[PDB]
Amino acid sequence: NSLSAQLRRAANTRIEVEGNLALSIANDLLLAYGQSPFNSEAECISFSPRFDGTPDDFRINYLKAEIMSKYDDFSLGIDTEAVAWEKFLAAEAECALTNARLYRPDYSEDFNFSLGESCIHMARRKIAKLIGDVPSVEGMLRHCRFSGGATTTNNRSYGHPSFKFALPQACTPRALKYVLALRASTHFDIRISDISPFNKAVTVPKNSKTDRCIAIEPGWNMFFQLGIGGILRDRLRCWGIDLNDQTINQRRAHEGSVTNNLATVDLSAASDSISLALCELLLPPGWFEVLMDLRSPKGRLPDGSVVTYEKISSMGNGYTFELESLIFASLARSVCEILDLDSSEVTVYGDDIILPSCAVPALREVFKYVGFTTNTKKTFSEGPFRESCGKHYYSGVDVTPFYIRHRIVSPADLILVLNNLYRWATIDGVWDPRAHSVYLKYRKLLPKQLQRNTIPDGYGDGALVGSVLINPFAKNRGWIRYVPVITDHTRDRERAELGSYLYDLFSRCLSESNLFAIDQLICRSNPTKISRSTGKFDIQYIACSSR
């Protein structure tokens, strides 16, 4: 009764002190490592490191350049999402230049046409060899699904596929013929709200200096796009590309850290960079037709302004990830093939690429020809530092930092930060005596019961990571050991009955095709339950194990 209620109390106790607690933690941590503190909110984002010297210095300097970069509560500057819109408009104008360039070459500027076109043909032949002339309707269907967040019809709350089946969704005047076929394939009512070429473009937070431009597609469009993207992802395995597993690229980045034979390349504007023309070349008209059908040709901005897309698809599209992966893979494999290098050396996850360094100068010439810009302060073909898929390595050791992206208010946020610091500053559960004092100091900002409550690592951020055997709140019921954690408090919402039912029947329809592996055949998938979060916090007991 009182035991869980004390934690329920302490979770909802608002912890607040003068100044920026994130900046205080950052500065004290920097101080512990003997580095210059941020003396302004500008120095947080403006700091740039140098690649050299002992890895222990570089780790903390890179950390310094990183940790406070994504903090959103900065009173610094008038900085807006408008910069992201400038980057968007610019990226589109440039994609138009590269579109008209790919379509009709003007033979004297730059770009090495000889290499470029040969790469185009080779990549086209390889691609055609992979996916085939026409996408299978069967595969598309079996991968066709409703999921994710807002559509041009439903908002973030109604983004659940149940509400997608309940409420009519929009469609592209091309892709309409699909949603009719579907309608003819079921005795259920398949409705469309309106038929519009436009998709709703907005900006999701990315960094303090800039946001990220995200596209919101119509419902049915997403429904089929996820199908073709699904079969694309299924097809990319033959090229040795697993999009469900991002750890391979990280391991290979670690390889490129030491040997320095393997170079990594990152692409920011890649999502907005991919040309229509580049796709009409690299892809067979069979795939290109369904791609053009399912995609949103036009778009709308909160400014009310409309834009016709030079790009095929940006972020927030079903197949865009799989598509850009496939394309980058084709071009890079072609590059490595021209240079008589192993084609299995190149691995691509989204826009994150790893291929042998000797292939870079030819690759960067190819990419600049096809409309992909090469960012030198992102990609590393030479220096001891390499990064791919969320991991950063320097000379063999992982320098990967952490970020405080939000003003801390509740103790849960402080626990998140403390746990990130734990994971960064520890090796197999042993504290670096430098950061340990900062940890211990800011751990006194937590209520006593929120201090002494500990959980293992990987169990979530609902408590402080440490030795759980010494945890006083650990209760042994049966022979299983349970421990309480902070949990976001939720109150249930009413769900669409026919929507959830339809979602269920459709999830069952195509599910015909999909000692330890066999006993997992007993378990099933969870039913539809809708909840909305509250600003408050709750406490929940979970089962745990030391190892």
Partner: protein, 177 residues
């Protein structure tokens, strides 16, 4: 398995269904208005049909399939909206249609060697020119120029999937008449 069948067949039926017109079902009729559901939350309403000729009880019926034309947001423009592909590439494939069937010399430029041959860019479209078909004398072509405009005659194009094999020696070897 039959789901893919019904879906695909119905899809091909819709593609085969001509015009921007769509399928609908009459929900109800009135004197000045006939309501037909086309599958959207907003049902279409039409005034006209006939007045009295064949018009009456047997003429229109509830549950009968009716063709509803809505072009309002329908895009024949949305394609032509992007001016880069539409004007150039269509007329290009037209010229290529002229090329096949009693072949004509067309202007194209070699770029770089593919595997078995070279790529030639002819207007908007790209094509493949075999390596043995470069010229009469099979001298090493590594020393030959790339990026220069020459004339070739098309052998074969697939017309749906895009593959175009063009011969360089067609104008030269067959020159004499």
């Amino acid at each position: 398995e039959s789901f893919a069948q019904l879906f695909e067949e119905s899809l091909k039926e819709i593609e085969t269904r001509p015009g921007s017109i769509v399928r609908g079902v009459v929900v109800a009729i009135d004197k000045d208005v006939v309501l037909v559901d086309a599958g959207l939350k907003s049902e279409s309403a039409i005034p006209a049909e006939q007045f009295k000729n064949a018009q009456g009880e047997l003429e229109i019926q509830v549950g009968d399939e009716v063709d509803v034309a809505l072009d309002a947001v329908e895009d024949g423009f949305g394609e032509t909206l992007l001016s880069r592909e539409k004007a150039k590439r269509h007329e290009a494939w037209i010229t290529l249609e002229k090329a096949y069937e009693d072949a004509e010399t067309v202007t194209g430029v070699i770029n770089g060697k593919v595997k078995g041959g070279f790529t030639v860019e002819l207007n908007g479209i790209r094509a493949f020119l075999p390596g043995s078909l470069v010229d009469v004398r099979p001298v090493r072509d590594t020393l030959h120029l790339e990026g220069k405009e020459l004339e070739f005659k098309v052998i074969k194009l697939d017309q749906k999937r895009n593959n175009v094999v063009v011969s360089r020696r067609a104008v030269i070897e067959s020159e004499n008449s």
